[PDB]
């Protein structure tokens, strides 16, 4: 648990950090919610400290400073396949895209779509795509 | 050749007989005039809309349409006088160009304007109807806003047998420009031109090139499509057709390389041809700007920053006058601002253009 104790310290420290009126968020919240967890820990009596027991230590300290479409999935696919190139295949992005679990159908559909949005121009042997 | 027959048929001032793009509009329009002219009543009608969107040949199609009606006894005969605002030197001087164009006589911009008066507040010989034609409308404004004031109030009157329709790009004209009285007499007979769309455009360019196999349909379609996404007029779509065959001459390339030709800004590769002396101020600009934040600098922390990064790249020593005559040689391109006719060495320096292409240009 202690890469997720440093991953949430890091995320109250940040937004400690990003507001002026927050309390100073030193090494002593750390201690204080390591504290809180080995006290929630003794209370459930048990002899090692869950996760849950984390949790709610960090449920309390915020409560107390607050008292204080397939066409989008197709779209990024096909955006993943622009690494350097104007132009596209077509057989790798609907096999791309049909790896990810959709039908060539709307395969179809997202292109049509997005070539409406002049977007890119596909060419009429439907062999590369031309992004605009 | 093809190549010769397309740009022809491409040219601007090849206008076609009459294409029902605007055809509704059209229509519109020659029912309105018809009217006025059946009833013997005049009228006043104000049309707005962005330029390209072929609202001059619309009207003159229209007016060729009645004169060829008139030839054929089913109008009754009628005057017709066209003016353009900005092809006039003074605006009193229209009175005398309307007059002259009726009667023939030379008269001073006061008395034609009376002589025009008692023409049409007087109960003269019958006259055929006088259909007027005024363009580009918002150059004719005064700040007395007479002469505005008499052409939208003279057909009101009923001897006058008068017909006006006033072209203008602005629809606000007549609300945040036109007074009270007149503003409800051009009220609610506002016509709007939108632009083309896509499929207009495409339209447009296909009957341009009726029986011509010259251009692939997929650039046809791309340069209609990037007309659309950044103006919607027909006269650029034009050049850059017209283009495009120039540089084929030399596919879909030859149009990209005419419309990111004609349309993109030169300030980048200027920058990158710049010489060395230039780019090293340019740099020291620009670390001045990031030290203090500000976007206005005198010419003194400018130069200091210059000798520093002059000393950093082992540079020789820069005298004042040199960097004096760089400054102006980058002004006078209107990279930077600067008045240095008097002042010297307190100029204030404000970049013309934004400073990330700064950083994309300086960067490679
Ligand atoms: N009905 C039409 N269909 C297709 N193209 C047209 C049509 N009418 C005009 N055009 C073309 O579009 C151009 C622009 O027409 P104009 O009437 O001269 O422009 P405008 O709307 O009057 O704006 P300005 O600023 O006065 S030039 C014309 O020169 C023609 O080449
Ligand atoms: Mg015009």
């Given at each position: 648990?202690?890469?997720?104790?440093?991953?949430?310290?890091?995320?109250?420290?940040?937004?400690?950090?990003?507001?002026?009126?927050?309390?100073?968020?030193?090494?002593?919240?750390?201690?204080?919610?390591?504290?809180?967890?080995?006290?929630?820990?003794?209370?459930?009596?048990?002899?090692?400290?869950?996760?849950?027991?984390?949790?709610?230590?960090?449920?309390?300290?915020?409560?107390?400073?607050?008292?204080?479409?397939?066409?989008?999935?197709?779209?990024?696919?096909?955006?993943?396949?622009?690494?350097?190139?104007?132009?596209?295949?077509?057989?790798?992005?609907?096999?791309?895209?049909?790896?990810?679990?959709?039908?060539?159908?709307?395969?179809?559909?997202?292109?049509?779509?997005?070539?409406?949005?002049?977007?890119?121009?596909?060419?009429?042997?439907?062999?590369?795509?031309?992004?605009? | 050749?093809?190549?010769?027959?397309?740009?022809?048929?491409?040219?601007?001032?090849?206008?076609?007989?009459?294409?029902?793009?605007?055809?509704?509009?059209?229509?519109?329009?020659?029912?309105?005039?018809?009217?006025?002219?059946?009833?013997?009543?005049?009228?006043?009608?104000?049309?707005?809309?962005?330029?390209?969107?072929?609202?001059?040949?619309?009207?003159?199609?229209?007016?060729?349409?009645?004169?060829?009606?008139?030839?054929?006894?089913?109008?009754?005969?009628?005057?017709?006088?066209?003016?353009?605002?900005?092809?006039?030197?003074?605006?009193?001087?229209?009175?005398?160009?309307?007059?002259?164009?009726?009667?023939?006589?030379?008269?001073?911009?006061?008395?034609?304007?009376?002589?025009?008066?008692?023409?049409?507040?007087?109960?003269?010989?019958?006259?055929?109807?006088?259909?007027?034609?005024?363009?580009?409308?918002?150059?004719?404004?005064?700040?007395?806003?007479?002469?505005?004031?008499?052409?939208?109030?003279?057909?009101?009157?009923?001897?006058?047998?008068?017909?006006?329709?006033?072209?203008?790009?602005?629809?606000?004209?007549?609300?945040?420009?036109?007074?009270?009285?007149?503003?409800?007499?051009?009220?609610?007979?506002?016509?709007?031109?939108?632009?083309?769309?896509?499929?207009?455009?495409?339209?447009?360019?296909?009957?341009?090139?009726?029986?011509?196999?010259?251009?692939?349909?997929?650039?046809?379609?791309?340069?209609?499509?990037?007309?659309?996404?950044?103006?919607?007029?027909?006269?650029?779509?034009?050049?850059?057709?017209?283009?495009?065959?120039?540089?084929?001459?030399?596919?879909?390339?030859?149009?990209?390389?005419?419309?990111?030709?004609?349309?993109?800004?030169?300030?980048?590769?200027?920058?990158?041809?710049?010489?060395v002396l230039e780019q090293s101020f340019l740099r020291a600009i620009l670390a001045e700007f990031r030290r203090s934040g500000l976007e206005e600098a005198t010419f003194q922390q400018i130069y200091s920053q210059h000798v520093a990064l002059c000393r950093m790249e082992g540079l020789p020593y820069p005298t004042m006058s040199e960097?004096?005559?760089?400054?102006?040689?980058?002004?006078?391109?209107?990279?930077?601002?600067?008045?240095?006719?008097?002042?010297?060495?307190?100029?204030?320096?404000?970049?013309?253009?934004?400073?990330?292409?700064?950083?994309?240009?300086?960067?490679?």
């Open positions: 648990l202690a890469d997720y104790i440093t991953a949430a310290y890091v995320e109250m420290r940040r937004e400690a950090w990003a507001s002026k009126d927050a309390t100073y968020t030193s090494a002593r919240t750390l201690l204080a919610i390591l504290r809180l967890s080995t006290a929630l820990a003794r209370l459930r009596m048990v002899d090692v400290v869950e996760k849950e027991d984390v949790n709610e230590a960090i449920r309390l300290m915020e409560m107390s400073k607050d008292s204080l479409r397939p066409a989008d999935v197709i779209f990024a696919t096909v955006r993943e396949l622009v690494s350097g190139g104007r132009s596209v295949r077509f057989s790798e992005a609907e096999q791309r895209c049909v790896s990810r679990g959709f039908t060539p159908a709307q395969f179809q559909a997202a292109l049509d779509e997005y070539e409406e949005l002049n977007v890119w121009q596909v060419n009429a042997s439907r062999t590369r795509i031309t992004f605009v | 050749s093809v190549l010769e027959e397309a740009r022809l048929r491409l040219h601007v001032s090849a206008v076609p007989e009459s294409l029902p793009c605007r055809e509704q509009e059209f229509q519109d329009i020659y029912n309105f005039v018809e009217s006025k002219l059946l009833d013997h009543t005049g009228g006043c009608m104000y049309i707005s809309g962005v330029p390209g969107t072929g609202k001059t040949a619309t009207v003159h199609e229209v007016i060729r349409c009645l004169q060829q009606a008139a030839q054929a006894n089913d109008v009754p005969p009628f005057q017709y006088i066209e003016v353009n605002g900005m092809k006039l030197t003074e605006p009193h001087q229209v009175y005398v160009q309307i007059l002259q164009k009726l009667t023939g006589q030379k008269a001073t911009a006061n008395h034609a304007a009376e002589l025009l008066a008692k023409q049409f507040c007087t109960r003269g010989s019958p006259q055929e109807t006088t259909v007027l034609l005024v363009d580009e409308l918002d150059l004719l404004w005064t700040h007395k806003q007479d002469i505005m004031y008499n052409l939208f109030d003279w057909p009101t009157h009923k001897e006058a047998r008068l017909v006006v329709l006033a072209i203008a790009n602005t629809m606000d004209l007549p609300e945040r420009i036109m007074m009270n009285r007149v503003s409800s007499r051009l009220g609610l007979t506002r016509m709007c031109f939108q632009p083309y769309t896509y499929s207009q455009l495409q339209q447009i360019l296909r009957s341009r090139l009726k029986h011509l196999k010259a251009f692939e349909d997929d650039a046809i379609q791309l340069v209609a499509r990037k007309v659309a996404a950044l103006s919607g007029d027909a006269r650029r779509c034009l050049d850059i057709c017209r283009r495009a065959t120039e540089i084929c001459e030399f596919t879909i390339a030859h149009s990209m390389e005419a419309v990111d030709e004609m349309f993109s800004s030169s300030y980048i590769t200027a920058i990158k041809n710049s010489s960097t004096m005559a760089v400054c102006s040689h980058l002004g006078s391109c209107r990279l930077l601002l600067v008045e240095p006719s008097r002042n010297d060495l307190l100029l204030r320096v404000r970049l013309n253009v934004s400073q990330d292409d700064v950083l994309y240009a300086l960067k490679d």
